[PDB]
């Protein structure tokens, strides 16, 4: 299995560049490429990705051509350039999975048994990461249900190395927020977290509506994960917790009051100094 996938910034700019160049000349939905990376103990670290020619027919959903010789030659070239990178999976810019993704995953497994599909969306979404690493799982499902190839999910996160970090910092030095918890950025982040929570809850509610109406199947799994979530609710308004939280709020407010007093005294001292300076300047004027 793969416990997590780290997609370095270059993979993303390579996948944005491939989508742009293919889209600019002709029009093609989705963009398929091979992901190259190194294996940690269990955390796959994707660093580079190269394009692979890929024609598909959306209508049939079973016709798709992916170069074998082209992929092998590209991998040989990259091994000559840097051999520490072995094939670890494939990426396609298509926002949603596709019915033929399983065959492509098997073809990739032909080159790497532990293949991770990272769906690198090229549409900027303000709520969430741009990667979603998927893996192929064949099981018996235990709970007496038909088994199929499917796509198990693995946590994805975007890291970077020193060189990529330096490049990113140079690139985003004009649209980057200051590092440090300025109150403006803290309040904005809290608002962003509220918005993200609202979006996640809306997605969960839409899925629950679909399940209730029958449009989608009752999982019998993960659903009780939502039940566990609903059990883990804080249960505020308990008397003991209310007293403790009031104690904490007052303990913080006393420090805030001391800070406000210090700020007021400093401001008053500065005002006194400025007034005396102005008066002295006026007196020395004549």
């Amino acid at each position: 299995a793969v416990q997590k996938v780290v997609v370095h910034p270059l993979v993303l700019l390579s996948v944005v560049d491939h989508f742009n160049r293919i889209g600019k000349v002709g029009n093609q939905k989705r963009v398929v490429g091979v992901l190259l990376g190194s294996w940690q103990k269990k955390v796959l670290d994707v660093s580079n990705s190269f394009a692979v020619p890929f024609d598909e027919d959306d209508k049939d959903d079973s016709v798709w051509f992916l170069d074998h010789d082209y992929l092998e030659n590209m991998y040989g070239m990259f091994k000559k350039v840097n051999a520490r990178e072995r094939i670890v999976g494939w990426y396609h810019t298509g926002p949603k999975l596709h019915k033929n993704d399983i065959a492509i995953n098997e073809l990739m497994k032909r080159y790497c048994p532990n293949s991770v599909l990272v769906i690198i969306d090229v549409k900027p979404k303000d709520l969430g990461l741009p990667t979603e690493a998927y893996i192929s799982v064949e099981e018996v499902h235990d709970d007496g249900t038909p088994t199929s190839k499917t796509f198990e999910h693995v946590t994805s996160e975007i890291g970077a190395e020193e060189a990529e970090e330096v490049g990113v910092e140079h690139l985003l030095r004009d649209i980057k927020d200051t590092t440090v918890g300025t109150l403006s950025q803290r309040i904005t982040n809290q608002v962003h977290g509220l918005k993200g929570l609202n979006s996640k809850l809306l997605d969960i509610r839409s899925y629950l509506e679909k399940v209730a109406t029958g449009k989608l199947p009752i999982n019998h799994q993960i659903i009780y994960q939502l039940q566990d979530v609903f059990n883990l609710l804080p249960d505020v308004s308990l008397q003991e917790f209310v007293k403790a939280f009031y104690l904490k709020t007052n303990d913080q407010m006393v420090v805030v009051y001391l800070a406000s007093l210090i700020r007021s005294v400093v401001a008053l001292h500065n005002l006194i100094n400025n007034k005396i300076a102005n008066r002295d300047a006026e007196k020395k004027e004549g």
Partner: protein, 288 residues
């Protein structure tokens, strides 16, 4: 004819990242690779992609450009959709800055033999360790025109003298045998909204209440140190020595008691406390 100092080597976001990565892979040695782009016009050289050439015992020299490797790489990249020409070459100068040596000049002349505008790029992965990216674009100055005309670049505009030459490049031959070209970074959205995800902060981070134990410890420590600093501020203000007070405020400037170690701490405390309290109340409301 003459090259304008207004020429601008456009380096794409992907190209800079790839060049930095390749340079940082080689250190302690020197890596080199061909740069793929377009000579869009006389005053601009646009580089879209850069592909590394395999490390070889020759080093960064005309023989580092394995013809078979380059030919097959270009042929296979054409199929994907990148039918770009070779606009120049890049090589990493570990340790030393962006300049060109004799072998570098020979390789640059060999590249120029194909096209008169084949720009050369030098990147130092060791110097470019922070928000500074020490990347320079260099092209050869016909030593002939050194006397036949005068300098090599027309100055029809001010878009080039807004930069400064470097003692290093000057020592190794800048404005003598090699002349730098302004490096402009071609960045676009989608490629800037994807890179603001290296550290984007999950929604959860903006609703985590920190931990009240170390929060209390930090508040206590900051308050105690602010009490000491208030003692110092008391001593400084109550003194109010008038022996040329304007001079006193300048003879005791050491980033000390008065305000620096002062309300700086007030801001730290109040920001932390306000953020923590607001997060706590937002959680008390949102979660049940």
């Amino acid at each position: 004819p003459a090259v304008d100092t207004a020429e601008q080597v456009y380096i794409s976001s992907l190209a800079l990242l790839k060049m930095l990565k390749h340079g940082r892979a080689g250190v302690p040695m020197e890596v080199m690779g061909l740069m793929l782009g377009e000579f869009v016009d006389d005053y601009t050289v646009r580089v879209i992609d850069v592909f590394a050439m395999p490390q070889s015992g020759t080093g960064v020299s005309v023989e580092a450009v394995d013809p078979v490797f380059q030919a097959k790489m270009l042929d296979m990249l054409k199929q994907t959709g990148r039918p770009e020409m070779v606009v120049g070459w890049y090589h990493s100068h570990p340790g030393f800055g962006c300049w060109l040596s004799g072998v570098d000049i020979n390789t640059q002349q060999s590249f120029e033999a194909l096209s008169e505008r084949a720009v050369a790029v030098v990147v130092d992965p060791i110097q470019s360790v922070k928000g500074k990216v020490v990347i320079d674009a260099f092209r050869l100055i016909n030593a002939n025109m050194m006397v036949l005309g005068h300098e090599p670049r027309q100055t029809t505009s001010n878009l080039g003298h807004l930069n400064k030459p470097s003692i290093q490049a000057l020592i190794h031959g800048l404005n003598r045998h090699y002349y730098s070209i302004t490096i402009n970074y071609r960045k676009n959205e989608l490629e800037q909204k994807m890179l603001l995800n290296l550290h984007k902060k999950s929604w959860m981070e903006g609703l985590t209440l920190q931990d009240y134990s170390e929060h209390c410890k930090h508040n206590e420590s900051v308050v105690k140190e602010m009490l000491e600093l208030a003692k110092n501020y008391n001593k400084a203000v109550e003194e109010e020595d008038k022996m040329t007070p304007e001079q006193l405020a300048i003879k005791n400037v050491g980033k000390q008691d008065p305000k620096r170690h002062l309300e700086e701490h007030v801001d730290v405390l109040m920001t932390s406390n306000i953020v923590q309290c607001l997060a706590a109340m937002l959680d008390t409301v949102v979660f049940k």
